[PDB]
Amino acid sequence: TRTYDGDGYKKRAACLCFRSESEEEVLLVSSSRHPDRWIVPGGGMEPEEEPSVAAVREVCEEAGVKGTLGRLVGIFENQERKHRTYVYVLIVTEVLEDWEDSVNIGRKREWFKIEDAIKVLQYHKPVQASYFET
Ligand SMILES: O=P(O)(O)CP(=O)(O)O[C@H]1[C@H](OP(=O)(O)O)[C@@H](OP(=O)(O)O)[C@@H](OP(=O)(O)O)[C@@H](OP(=O)(O)O)[C@@H]1OP(=O)(O)O
């Protein structure tokens, strides 16, 4: 079930899934609509679902990783799509091999240096590139 803020923006949660506490490498996933495009994993919050819980669930489903939830980075609007996304740091401790979106839609995942993640997100997802601005 899709959920919305009082202003009609769709509620979403995402994680910056880092390889380590050094936060030098981040996990991106392929778009289901355009498999040649990289995105930050995330998705819709369920009714009464805490944003930190939604963020962890969505990175499990989309990226097949689990780890240690860290700080809220911020709340980011995509005006064009009317999305409002809570973005958390996650330090990856488990990389699972046969995850929901691999099985179901062949979603891919790849580690990026932060500078390269910003580069590949800039064109289609400038708001996601801004998640890394700190
Ligand atoms: O959830 P996904 O697919 O794995 C990743 P996304 O949300 O970034 O994909 C969006 C895609 O974004 P992208 O593939 O760049 O991640 C964008 O692509 P755009 O046309 O370049 O804006 C649109 O796709 P289409 O071109 O197929 O309509 C969006 O369609 P909407 O009209 O908003 O429904 C897609 O939204 P979707 O419905 O798939 O969630």
From Swiss-Prot:
EC supergroup of this enzyme: hydrolase
UniProt keyword Transferase present: no
Keywords, sorted A to Z: Acetylation, Cytoplasm, Hydrolase, Magnesium, Manganese, Metal-binding, Nucleus, Zinc
GO molecular function, a single term: bis(5'-adenosyl)-hexaphosphatase activity
Top-level taxon of the source organism: Eukaryota
Required co-factors: Mg(2+); Mn(2+); Zn(2+)
Entry's transmembrane regions: none
E.C. number: 3.6.1.52, 3.6.1.61, 3.6.1.10, 3.6.1.62
GO cellular component: cytoplasm; cytosol; glutamatergic synapse; nucleus
Binding site for substrate: R2, K10, K11, R12, S31, S32, R33, R81, K82, H83, R107, K125
Compartments, record wording: Cytoplasm; Nucleus
Catalytic-site annotation from UniProt: E61
Stated regulation of activity: Endopolyphospahatase activity is inhibited by NaF, NaPPi, beta-glycerol phosphate and heparin. 5-diphosphoinositol pentakisphosphate (5-InsP7) inhibits its mRNA decapping activity.
Ranges for domain Nudix hydrolase: 9-134
UniProt key word NAD: no
Annotated binding of Mg(2+) 1, by residue: G42, E62
Oligomer and partners: Monomer.
UniProt protein name: Diphosphoinositol polyphosphate phosphohydrolase 1
Species for this entry: Homo sapiens (Human)
GN (gene name): NUDT3
